[PDB]
């Protein structure tokens, strides 16, 4: 309470984090329906930290609160809390959600994530792993039977134990290395070696434990190091096919398919004829040359990188011009991370 025009003093212990967001990381912190600590608003938007401690002024410990608090302290712009039985309703309604993070949540977020992928909203899910320790006699095909076999998700096993002692769901640690990588290196670089500060894993993972969980369903360890501490260590999705392995090339094609979808809806009600098929083809081509130039594609000429076709005998038919349908088929080559660095030493010079 402020009364007189002077300078006021207080010692109520508060904290406040700044905002250093990126536009390609707008998550969906899904929480369980079996929870009375949350505000009964089913969907709510949190643009920064100073608004999140107005709705929730006291520090909790629950899995939705150590997930948002570890989000906002690494930048992080707006982000959502939705019930686990309403995430299909909120993806379809706010139009800028680029991530679904299961903040200590399963068995129906896994279901309703598979709902929105078949509807094709270009989302990328971030799931969790086991909360108690995997043994070592685990037979990994029995642990990752639960998880979807879609290329739009990743799992990230070791749970967090941030400085207050509370548990962090490892969908929030893995979404904290996506804020700091889309800001810094872009969406095409793998989110792995980015250091997330103020958290420590609950358990420890040896190199020989991660080696059986690397191929297949790709459990994506969180590991601490001397130097770059408590990074996430592994950047693979839930499918080991040779094009939708590697988390970054999937999010590189989400943002390509969506920045061309939002740049070419401003060309509706044009005549569906040959001048329109040109200014499609030079609007796609101008976008991808801004993208090839900042190191996001592969090949050292723009003919090496992308192609695009739209037209009469290329990709459409006269049955489809007369009912409106414009089909724009693009093909583009992305880069791959260097995952294994083999040092082979010798004795002779």
């Amino acid at each position: 309470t402020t009364t007189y025009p002077g300078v006021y003093l207080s010692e109520d212990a508060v904290s406040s984090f700044s905002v250093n967001s990126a536009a390609t990381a707008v998550p969906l912190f899904a929480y369980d329906s079996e929870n009375t600590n949350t505000i009964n608003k089913p969907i709510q938007v949190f643009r920064n930290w100073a608004e999140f401690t107005v709705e929730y002024p006291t520090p909790l410990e629950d899995a939705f609160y150590t997930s948002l608090s570890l989000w906002f302290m690494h930048g992080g712009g707006k982000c959502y809390l939705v019930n686990e039985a309403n995430i299909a309703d909120a993806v379809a309604q706010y139009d800028d959600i680029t991530l679904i993070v299961a903040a200590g949540t399963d068995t129906t977020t896994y279901t309703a994530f598979t709902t929105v992928v078949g509807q094709g909203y270009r989302i990328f899910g971030l799931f969790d792993g086991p909360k108690e320790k995997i043994a070592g006699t685990a037979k990994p095909d029995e642990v990752m039977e639960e998880y979807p076999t879609s290329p739009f998700g990743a799992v990230f096993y070791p749970w967090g134990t941030l400085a207050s002692g509370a548990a962090v769901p490892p969908s929030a640690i893995a979404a904290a290395s996506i804020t700091q990588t889309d800001r810094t290196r872009g969406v095409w670089k793998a989110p792995a070696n980015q250091a997330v500060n103020g958290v420590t894993p609950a358990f420890a993972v040896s190199d020989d434990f991660q080696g059986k969980y690397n191929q297949g369903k790709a459990l994506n360890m969180i590991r601490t190091f001397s130097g770059q501490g408590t990074v996430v260590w592994g950047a693979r999705t839930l499918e080991d096919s040779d094009n939708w392995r590697y988390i970054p090339v999937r999010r590189l094609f989400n943002a390509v398919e969506r920045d061309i979808q939002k740049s070419l809806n401003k060309l509706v009600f044009e005549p569906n004829s040959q001048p329109t098929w040109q200014r499609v083809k030079a609007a796609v081509d101008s976008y991808l040359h801004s993208l090839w130039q900042q190191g996001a594609l592969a090949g050292n000429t723009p003919a090496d990188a992308w192609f695009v076709q739209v037209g009469k005998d290329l990709t459409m038919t006269q049955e489809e011009i007369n009912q409106g349908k414009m089909i724009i088929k693009i093909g583009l080559a992305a880069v791959r991370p260097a995952e294994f660095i083999i040092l082979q030493f010798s004795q002779d010079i």
Binding site: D242, N243, V249, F253, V256, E257, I260, Q261, L264, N265, L267, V268, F269, E270, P271, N272, S273, T276, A298, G299, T301, A303, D304, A305, W306, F307, Q309, T315, I321, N322, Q323, G324, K325, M326, I327, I328, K329, I330, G331, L332, A333, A334, R336
Partner: protein, 275 residues
């Protein structure tokens, strides 16, 4: 709407000029050949297209009926007004108190019944050399004339173009190999050269490439539609048709550089024309 035709300009020159010229003179629209009436004789003499007022217009659409609108042109009409009559010779003529109310009609009408025109009222353009030629083509009788310039748009013909609006848009992005179409084409040449003096044979064939979208591509596996055009010797066109036909339907692509595996859908070969 605004497209006034050329008879609509003559009717615009009669409404503006009857109002100031006296009620019993005449308003005539030719040159007179015994006239027995005064007849000031508005005369049009060229309809050249005004280049200075045309733009880069973009052929507008309808989108409710789905039709392209005819893209007009705008010409400049160039009248000149005289006074034929048929002594009068006083400073207060009958011939000049009529030409005093002709230019008073022009001075007041810098904007006609055609309110979207562009008018020059009495430009300084003519000369005693140039008036002296016109005064001879009348048949050697000089007069006092008043030129008056008007441009106006005239629309083209109207046919049903019938394009359709867009209303929906599909975008699909698939992985490709880092091959250029240049790296593809110049690999198919010495891929073909080994398929056969053969370097002398396929010198003037060209075989441009364009990559087909390949609906489910990969990081390898580019898929390419050819078109082969050019010139070849007489005997070599027949073995080249076999290596085209196996490329079109092949179990394992075609020549592939460093694991890329270029694929082919159509050889085409319309323009080879072996001599």
């Amino acid at each position: 709407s605004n497209y006034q035709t050329l008879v609509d300009v003559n009717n615009a020159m009669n409404k503006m000029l009857r109002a100031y010229v006296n009620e019993a003179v005449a308003i005539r629209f030719d040159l007179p050949d015994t006239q027995a009436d005064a007849a000031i004789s508005v005369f049009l003499y060229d309809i050249h297209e005004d280049l200075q007022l045309r733009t880069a217009e973009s052929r507008g659409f309808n989108a409710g009926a789905g039709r392209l609108l005819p893209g007009w042109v705008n010409v400049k009409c160039n009248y000149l007004i005289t006074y034929w009559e048929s002594p009068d010779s006083q400073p207060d003529n009958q011939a000049i108190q009529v030409m005093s109310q002709v230019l008073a009609a022009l001075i007041n009408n810098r904007q006609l019944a055609d309110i979207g025109a562009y008018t020059q009222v009495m430009p300084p353009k003519e000369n005693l050399n140039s008036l002296g030629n016109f005064w001879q083509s009348l048949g050697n009788r000089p007069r006092l004339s008043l030129n008056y310039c008007v441009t106006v748009p005239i629309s083209l013909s109207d046919k049903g173009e019938e394009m359709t609006p867009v209303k929906s848009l599909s975008t699909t992005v698939e992985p490709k190999a880092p091959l250029s179409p240049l790296v593809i084409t110049d690999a198919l040449r010495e891929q073909l050269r080994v398929a056969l003096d053969a370097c002398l044979a396929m010198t003037h064939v060209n075989l441009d490439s364009s990559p087909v979208a390949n609906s489910d591509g990969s990081a390898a596996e580019i898929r390419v539609s050819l078109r082969v055009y050019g010139m070849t010797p007489t005997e070599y066109l027949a073995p080249m048709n076999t290596v085209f036909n196996e490329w079109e339907k092949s179990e394992a692509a075609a020549v592939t550089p460093d694991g890329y595996r270029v694929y082919i859908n159509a050889v085409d070969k319309t323009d080879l024309t072996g001599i």
